[PDB]
């Protein structure tokens, strides 16, 4: 794992010798080269994992993570870079080397093999994600969003702390293959009670769970668009592995203490997609919609079956891809008509066909048309909630009408109808746009002709 | 026939001849706790480090 660490942490002498013209180019140009470099990590076998060393592991769960991070790393360094523009040149090489460690955090978050390095790590990511939206972010809401999402993080994640320095000292050892074989059985305690609810409870506030989701909508809207791809597609998911990793250590307990929170998700994605039919704001909108999502992967992993954990390996990079592009596209409209709210700006199709098109794609693979990789989690997902209870898939079909109810109705105010008549600076739509849509939307779209490598480490 | 001693003569330390034997235990005391075992043995390297969580060394 030290062929990806070395050149992520050599990207920085990179940024800060090169020119005040020509650092955008080199770090696109040599986080391609990453991007291509990470190809190296498929070799996965049917039965072992890929181990490295004593500290750095890889199987088929991280390994999609991984690519989807080294990828997407780019393509914020393209999309950053018409809002600081006019930027002074050292705040400039301050913003990539934030994206750089930030990227280097995850990459080594998503490989240790031990478990308080992964801690580490995962609170290693809050440093450089809170200075970048505190920081460049625009109004004035983005410092209480940065509080909001600081303290819920760490709030629910310091017992997770006391509960793995606590297994470090029962159990002996924390890492993860010494733990798959020397699990013991948790029985029925208040103290196995409350274990089950520190190891739990930091990945739920990062998930988010319903009812501990109220720093999305805030740290998800006053960030830049960097920050909303990181926000969106890495650190939910990060808090979903996460969870993939630490519930084995938690059985049989789990069979019956996931029952309160699943119905925490099952109810909660039917509100949550409501208030995107309701939704004032673009980006609010993309938000919900990410906790819907979200909370449909949380009931995946409480249940615990092999199809379940496919269907949330799938749906989470597939989701990081959808809502990566859909903020791209808000962000785009945003710097054109320099408003976020929805209803501003309509009648696109007339003025900007291409990037119409992009939107009714994004859109279609939002609400998981098939075959797309979308599809294939939320029908996997699907299947096991109806073999673990059948009432279930009433909470799921409803959930199946409202999504589209907001995806299309997120195509039609934006794109559809006649044009605003006093807004006349919509300009045609860049390269730079374009080919950040392209390369966001192609992938995904090849990821449905081979979707067997992002089908989780039990496919 | 008596001369009396000049200065410093008194208190001179003497040597005394006696027959009742030295009393090997004057103050009563009973036995010692037994000290804690020494150390001994070479210096060999720690057993994989520090062992402290991710540490290797």
């Given at each position: 794992m030290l062929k990806y660490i070395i050149p992520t942490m050599m990207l920085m002498p990179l940024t800060w010798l090169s020119k005040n013209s020509m650092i955008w180019i080199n770090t696109t140009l040599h986080s391609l080269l990453i991007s291509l470099t990470?190809?190296?990590?498929?070799?996965?076998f049917g039965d072992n994992s890929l181990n490295f060393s004593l500290t750095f592991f890889s199987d088929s769960l991280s390994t999609p993570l991984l690519i989807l991070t080294m990828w997407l790393l780019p393509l914020m360094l393209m999309a950053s870079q018409h809002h600081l523009s006019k930027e002074n040149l050292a705040r400039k090489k301050l913003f990539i080397s934030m994206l750089i460690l930030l990227q280097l955090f995850l990459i080594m978050t998503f490989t240790a093999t031990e478990l308080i390095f992964f801690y580490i790590m995962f609170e290693a990511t809050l440093v450089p994600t809170l200075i970048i939206i505190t920081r460049?972010?625009?109004?004035?809401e983005r410092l209480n969003a940065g509080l909001y999402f600081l303290f819920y993080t760490l709030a629910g994640s310091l017992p997770l702390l006391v509960a793995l320095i606590y297994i470090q000292n029962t159990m002996g050892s924390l890492n993860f293959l010494i733990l798959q074989y020397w699990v013991q059985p948790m029985p029925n305690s208040w103290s196995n009670t409350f274990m089950w609810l520190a190891c739990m409870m930091a990945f739920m506030v990062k998930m988010p769970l319903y009812g501990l989701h109220l720093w999305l909508p805030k740290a998800h809207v006053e960030a830049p668009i960097a920050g909303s791809m990181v926000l969106a597609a890495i650190l939910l998911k990060l808090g979903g592995y996460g969870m993939m990793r630490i519930t084995?250590?938690?059985?049989?307990?789990?069979?019956?203490?996931?029952y309160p929170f699943i119905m925490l998700s099952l109810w909660g994605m039917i509100m949550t997609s409501s208030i995107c039919l309701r939704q004032t704001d673009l980006k609010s909108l993309i938000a919900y919609s990410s906790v819907s999502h979200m909370a449909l992967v949380i009931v995946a992993i409480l249940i615990q079956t092999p199809w379940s954990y496919m269907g949330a390996t799938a749906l989470m990079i597939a989701h990081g891809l959808t809502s990566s592009m859909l903020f791209c596209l808000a962000n785009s409209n945003y710097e054109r008509?320099?408003?976020?709210?929805?209803?501003?700006?309509?009648?696109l199709q007339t003025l900007l066909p291409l990037m119409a098109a992009w939107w009714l794609l994004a859109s279609l693979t939002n609400l998981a048309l098939p075959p797309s990789i979308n599809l294939i989690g939320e029908l996997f997902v699907v299947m096991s909630t109806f073999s673990w209870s059948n009432i279930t898939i009433i909470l799921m079909g409803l959930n199946m009408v409202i999504t589209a109810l907001y995806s299309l109705y997120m195509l039609i105010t934006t794109q559809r109808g006649k044009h605003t008549h006093?807004?006349?600076?919509?300009l045609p739509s860049f390269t730079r746009e374009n080919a950040l849509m392209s390369l966001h939307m192609l992938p995904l779209l090849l990821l449905s002709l081979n979707p067997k490598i992002i089908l989780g480490p039990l496919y | 026939g008596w001369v009396r001693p000049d200065l410093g003569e008194l208190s001179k330390v003497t040597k005394v001849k006696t027959d009742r034997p030295l009393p090997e235990n004057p103050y009563h005391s009973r036995a010692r706790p037994e000290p804690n075992p020494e150390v001994e043995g070479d210096l060999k390297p720690a057993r994989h480090g520090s062992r402290l969580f991710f540490w290797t060394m």
């Amino acid at each position: 794992m030290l062929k990806y660490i070395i050149p992520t942490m050599m990207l920085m002498p990179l940024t800060w010798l090169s020119k005040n013209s020509m650092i955008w180019i080199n770090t696109t140009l040599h986080s391609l080269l990453i991007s291509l470099t990470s190809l190296l990590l498929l070799n996965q076998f049917g039965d072992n994992s890929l181990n490295f060393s004593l500290t750095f592991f890889s199987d088929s769960l991280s390994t999609p993570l991984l690519i989807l991070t080294m990828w997407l790393l780019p393509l914020m360094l393209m999309a950053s870079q018409h809002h600081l523009s006019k930027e002074n040149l050292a705040r400039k090489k301050l913003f990539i080397s934030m994206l750089i460690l930030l990227q280097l955090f995850l990459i080594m978050t998503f490989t240790a093999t031990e478990l308080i390095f992964f801690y580490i790590m995962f609170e290693a990511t809050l440093v450089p994600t809170l200075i970048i939206i505190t920081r460049w972010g625009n109004q004035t809401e983005r410092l209480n969003a940065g509080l909001y999402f600081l303290f819920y993080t760490l709030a629910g994640s310091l017992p997770l702390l006391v509960a793995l320095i606590y297994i470090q000292n029962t159990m002996g050892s924390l890492n993860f293959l010494i733990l798959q074989y020397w699990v013991q059985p948790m029985p029925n305690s208040w103290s196995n009670t409350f274990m089950w609810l520190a190891c739990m409870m930091a990945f739920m506030v990062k998930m988010p769970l319903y009812g501990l989701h109220l720093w999305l909508p805030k740290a998800h809207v006053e960030a830049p668009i960097a920050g909303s791809m990181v926000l969106a597609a890495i650190l939910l998911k990060l808090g979903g592995y996460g969870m993939m990793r630490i519930t084995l250590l938690l059985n049989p307990i789990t069979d019956f203490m996931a029952y309160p929170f699943i119905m925490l998700s099952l109810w909660g994605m039917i509100m949550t997609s409501s208030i995107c039919l309701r939704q004032t704001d673009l980006k609010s909108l993309i938000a919900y919609s990410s906790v819907s999502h979200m909370a449909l992967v949380i009931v995946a992993i409480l249940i615990q079956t092999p199809w379940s954990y496919m269907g949330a390996t799938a749906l989470m990079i597939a989701h990081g891809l959808t809502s990566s592009m859909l903020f791209c596209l808000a962000n785009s409209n945003y710097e054109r008509v320099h408003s976020r709210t929805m209803i501003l700006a309509r009648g696109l199709q007339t003025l900007l066909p291409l990037m119409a098109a992009w939107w009714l794609l994004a859109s279609l693979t939002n609400l998981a048309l098939p075959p797309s990789i979308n599809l294939i989690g939320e029908l996997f997902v699907v299947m096991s909630t109806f073999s673990w209870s059948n009432i279930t898939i009433i909470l799921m079909g409803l959930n199946m009408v409202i999504t589209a109810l907001y995806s299309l109705y997120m195509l039609i105010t934006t794109q559809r109808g006649k044009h605003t008549h006093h807004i006349n600076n919509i300009l045609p739509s860049f390269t730079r746009e374009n080919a950040l849509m392209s390369l966001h939307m192609l992938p995904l779209l090849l990821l449905s002709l081979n979707p067997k490598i992002i089908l989780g480490p039990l496919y | 026939g008596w001369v009396r001693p000049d200065l410093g003569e008194l208190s001179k330390v003497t040597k005394v001849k006696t027959d009742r034997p030295l009393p090997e235990n004057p103050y009563h005391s009973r036995a010692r706790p037994e000290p804690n075992p020494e150390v001994e043995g070479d210096l060999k390297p720690a057993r994989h480090g520090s062992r402290l969580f991710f540490w290797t060394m």
